Amino acid sequence: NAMQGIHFRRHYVRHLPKEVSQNDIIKALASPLINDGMVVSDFADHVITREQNFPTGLPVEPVGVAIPHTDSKYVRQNAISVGILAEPVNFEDAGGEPDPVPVRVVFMLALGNWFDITNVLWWIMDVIQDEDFMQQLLVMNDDEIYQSIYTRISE
Amino acid sequence: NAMQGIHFRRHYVRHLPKEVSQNDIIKALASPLINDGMVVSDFADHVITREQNFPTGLPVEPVGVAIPHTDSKYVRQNAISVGILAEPVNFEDAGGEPDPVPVRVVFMLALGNWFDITNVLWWIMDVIQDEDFMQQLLVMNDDEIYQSIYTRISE
Amino acid sequence: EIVLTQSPGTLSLSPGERATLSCRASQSVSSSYLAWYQQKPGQAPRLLIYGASSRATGIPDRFSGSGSGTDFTLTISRLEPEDFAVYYCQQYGSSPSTFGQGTKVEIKRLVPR
Amino acid sequence: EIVLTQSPGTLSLSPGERATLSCRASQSVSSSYLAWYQQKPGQAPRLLIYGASSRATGIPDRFSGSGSGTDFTLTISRLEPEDFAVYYCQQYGSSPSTFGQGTKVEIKRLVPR
Amino acid sequence: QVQLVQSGAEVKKPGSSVKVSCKASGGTFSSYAISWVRQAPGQGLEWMGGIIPIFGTANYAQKFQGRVTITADKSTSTAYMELSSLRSEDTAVYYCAREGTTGSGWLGKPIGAFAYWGQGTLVTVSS
Amino acid sequence: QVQLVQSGAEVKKPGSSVKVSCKASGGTFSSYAISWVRQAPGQGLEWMGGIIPIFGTANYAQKFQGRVTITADKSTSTAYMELSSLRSEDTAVYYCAREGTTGSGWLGKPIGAFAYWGQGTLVTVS
């Protein structure tokens, strides 16, 4: 499976308040990963730096997505966390276009193996093309989201 | 034609009696080529040196053949010179085997183009497949031999 | 750094015979991250097996991979002339990817010259 | 020796177009002894034309050889991206065989984005 | 298949730098990992590093970090390897390679292992 | 469908010699011309010399006379090129090549031009 070895908990699914900045999002999604020992304690700083220099916005619509991550050397165990935003927050387009991506769904990746990154990207790209499912993510509670993603993780 | 550009005269056919040594066979077949300016004047010396070190006897049936020649740089115009030996004369085997080749028919080659050698070799190996033709070479006179070979050169 | 040690160094076999090649890893590698390549002299490597046991697209059935943990095997069930070559294993379970040193599969001489 | 001079040195054309490559000899060469080769990057040369105008086995009609004496031509019709290569003429009318310096054929994008 | 075509042989002096290109055609570029691999003549294969173009940042083997720079130009589907401060010991054939995918089509699941290889680029360094 | 298979790449020290092999299969060895052609990195093709195995001795381009030895061994259907006193300038890919033929079978009329090529052998001089 593309998502073999990736740890995922209900505790890794977060609805974030409408106030949040991009940095706020990264810190909040990092939090449960740090405290489960999945990443280095300054993981959030390293993802923030990466995002500034090599952005991870994917210009899908009507639900924009971002895939923030950093160097695998900052990861101790494989995990993903998921942020649902109440209002869009701009991420820059990974493809290099000047127009921002209004993001509502954030997949933070903590992957310890560089050679596994494209597997998870491929899986994400597959997931976010169910238009109905992306819509559902904006209204589903954390348990509904956990189960829906867990099902998709398990092929 | 495989024999394109190869000069051949009645005077390039002779019978050699049983007394003649390998070296003097080579000198005899060289002689008319030298007179006609087809090769350098010490051509025979170079063919002898070649034969001594890289022999040209072919153990074909039923009549043994040799194909003495030397470096193309010693050739001025393309020619073949043919010898019929009254009795078998041993040439060493071109393919490096220890046993001598009893030769009766000698095709001396004077070719200015190294890249044409395998063409002429092909023609020789083709012509000699006619067992009846090879037998006739041992009994025909010089005029008959000339016409027979001329025909096979011409087409 | 994960070291891959291949054995034997050299394998001398006739066409039609089975070749059995080993790749030993200094640490456990997940089966999902072990590959085998063929390389002929003066040519680029060619992928044979990925994920320890999956044949790459177009690769003939006579090539098969197996194993897990520290111990992996490439089998060529019936050697063709075209199979005599160097074979490498590779792990890509972490950065940096590392390769074994290669096993040379060479044709046996039958008649002493 | 006999010198072969190819022109142009580089030829940049659009896909689908007709390419004309020239090979000029310093003295007359019998047409029986003039060949053309295609060398794609990282490959051995591939024989296209021999004896000036004869296509080698498997070579399609869109490669065409012509000329005589001191002036020979290779024509490539319906140019393909895959035709990216250096093309060499060769004479083998005596030792040593000599080669032209090659014409590098490049295929442009039909229309840059 | 995906085709990978590299730039031609480089004949270099010590202390110089070289930049080798790897142009991909016949498949997807953005979302699949491209690596660079070194092979000294008659010797084994060494992974230098790689890049996933859409994410923009290269990953390096420690051995090669800080003399090797790997980049990708999404607009031309071309990856690059730049080697600086060349020495004679750098003489080798350099390959780009791209991971394979599963199944039919161009956006299949990636396999990590290198299904596609460039033709190689010789860099010589001497004198 | 003649196949020419060459020996592997070699790194050589200045002054040394290298012997490259070229095994020919899928057709006739003895009576067809095999050539050696070298290509310095990024440069053009140079004919070094050639051999018709049955006649034992090679023909050399004079630039290579006395440093190159070309031989053939019928028992293994293999041709060789040995280059001595190697210098920096000898760094190159070395190809063997063999003339084509016409007609059916393996004993057809030769065409001189190089229809068949080995994969090349890289020699670097360190």
Task: Return the sign of the alpha-carbon dihedral for residues D95, B114, B29, B51.
Answer: positive
CA distance D66 to C87: 46
- Type and span of the H or E element at B150: helix B142-154
Q: Using a CB–CB cutoff of 8 Å, tell me whether D27 touches chain B.
A: no
Q: What is the DSSP string of A105-149?
A: EEEEEE-S-GGGHHHHHHHHHHHTT-HHHHHHHTT--HHHHHHHH
What distance in Å separates residue F25's CA from the closest CA in chain D? 17
CA distance F101 to B119: 10
Torsion of CA F84, F85, F86, F88, to 10 degrees: -150
Q: Say whether A112 and C30 touch across the interface (CB within 8 A).
A: no
CA distance A141 to A22: 22
Q: Say whether A115 and C30 touch across the interface (CB within 8 A).
A: no
Q: Say whether F122 and E41 touch across the interface (CB within 8 A).
A: yes
φ, ψ dihedrals at B20, nearest 5°: -70, 130
Q: Say whether D95 and B72 touch across the interface (CB within 8 A).
A: yes
CA distance F45 to F36: 10
Q: Using a CB–CB cutoff of 8 Å, tell me whether F108 touches chain D.
A: no
| Residue closest to B120 by CA, chosen among B149, B147, B95, B88 | B149
**In chain C, which among 12-71 make CB contacts under 8 A with chain F?**
40-43
Domain F1-126 coded CATH 2.60.40.10: yes
Q: β-strand E34-39 against E18-25: which pairing, if any? A: unpaired
Q: Residue B146 is which amino acid?
A: Y
Q: Using a CB–CB cutoff of 8 Å, tell me whether A96 touches chain E.
A: yes
Distances (CA, A) of F74 to D8, E103, F54, F111: 43, 48, 8, 22
CA distance A56 to A103: 10
Letter string b/e over residues E74-97, b meaning 16 or more CB atoms within 10 A of that residue's CB: eeebbbbbebeebeeebbbbbbbb
CA distance E125 to F15: 18
Where is chain F discontinuous (C–N over 2.5 Å), named by the preceding residue? Answer: none
What residues contact residue B125 under an 8 Å CB cut-off, 6+ apart? B58, B60, F31, F107
- Residue B130 belongs to what domain range? 1-155
| Longest Cα–Cα distance in chain B | 37
Identify which of D47, D100, D101 has the shortest CB distance to residue F114.
D47
Q: β-strand E121-125 against E10-12: which pairing, if any? A: parallel
CA distance C40 to C83: 9
Q: Using a CB–CB cutoff of 8 Å, tell me whether F33 touches chain C.
A: no
Q: Say whether F124 and E11 touch across the interface (CB within 8 A).
A: no
| Number of CB atoms found within 10 A of residue D91's CB | 24
Q: Say whether F8 and E93 touch across the interface (CB within 8 A).
A: no
Residues E110 and E99: beta-carbon distance below 8 Å: yes
CA distance D96 to B113: 9
The tokens for A17 are 């308040």
Q: Are B and F neighbours with ≥3 CB pairs closer than 8 A?
A: yes
Of the residues A69, A109, A115, the best mutation for testing chain E's interface (the one with the most E CB atoms within 10 Å of its CB) is A115
What residues contact residue A90 under an 8 Å CB cut-off, 6+ apart? A22, A57, A100, A101, A102, A103
| Residue closest to A84 by CA, chosen among A144, A5, A3, A35 | A144
Q: In angstroms, what is the resolution? A: 1.8
Q: β-strand C63-76 against F34-39: which pairing, if any? A: unpaired
Q: How many domains does chain B have?
A: 1
What CATH number should be reported for the domain holding residue A99? 3.40.930.10
Of the residues E57, E70, E93, E114, the best mutation for testing chain C's interface (the one with the most C CB atoms within 10 Å of its CB) is E114
Distances (CA, A) of E85 to E36, E37, E82, E125: 18, 18, 10, 10
All residues of chain B having their beta carbon less than 8 Å from the beta carbon of residue D93 are: 113, 115
- Tell me which DSSP letter residue B32 carries: H
Q: Say whether A95 and E54 touch across the interface (CB within 8 A).
A: yes
All domains of chain C in start order, with CATH:
1-113 (2.60.40.10)
Fold assignment, E1-127: Immunoglobulin-like (2.60.40)
**Assign residue F124 a region: left if phi > 0, alpha if psi is -120 to 50, beta otherwise?**
beta
Task: Sort F107 into a burial class: Cβ within 10 Å, 0-12 / 13-18 / 19+.
Answer: middle
Residues B97 and B58: beta-carbon distance below 8 Å: no
| Closest alpha carbon within chain A to C94 | A113
Q: Using a CB–CB cutoff of 8 Å, tell me whether F42 touches chain D.
A: no
Q: Residue F8 is which amino acid?
A: G
What distance in Å separates residue A53's CA from the closest CA in chain C? 22
The tokens for A118 are 């494209």
The tokens for E82 are 């730049």
Q: β-strand A101-110 against A64-66: which pairing, if any? A: parallel
**In chain C, which among 69-98 make CB contacts under 8 A with chain F?**
81
| Residue closest to C86 by CA, chosen among D22, A136, A109, F9 | F9
The tokens for E66 are 């800080």
Q: Say whether D41 and E25 touch across the interface (CB within 8 A).
A: no
Q: Say whether D41 and E5 touch across the interface (CB within 8 A).
A: yes
Q: β-strand D10-13 against C85-91: which pairing, if any? A: unpaired
Q: Using a CB–CB cutoff of 8 Å, tell me whether F73 touches chain B.
A: no
Residues E98 and E26: beta-carbon distance below 8 Å: no
CA distance B127 to B107: 12
Q: Say whether F75 and C113 touch across the interface (CB within 8 A).
A: yes
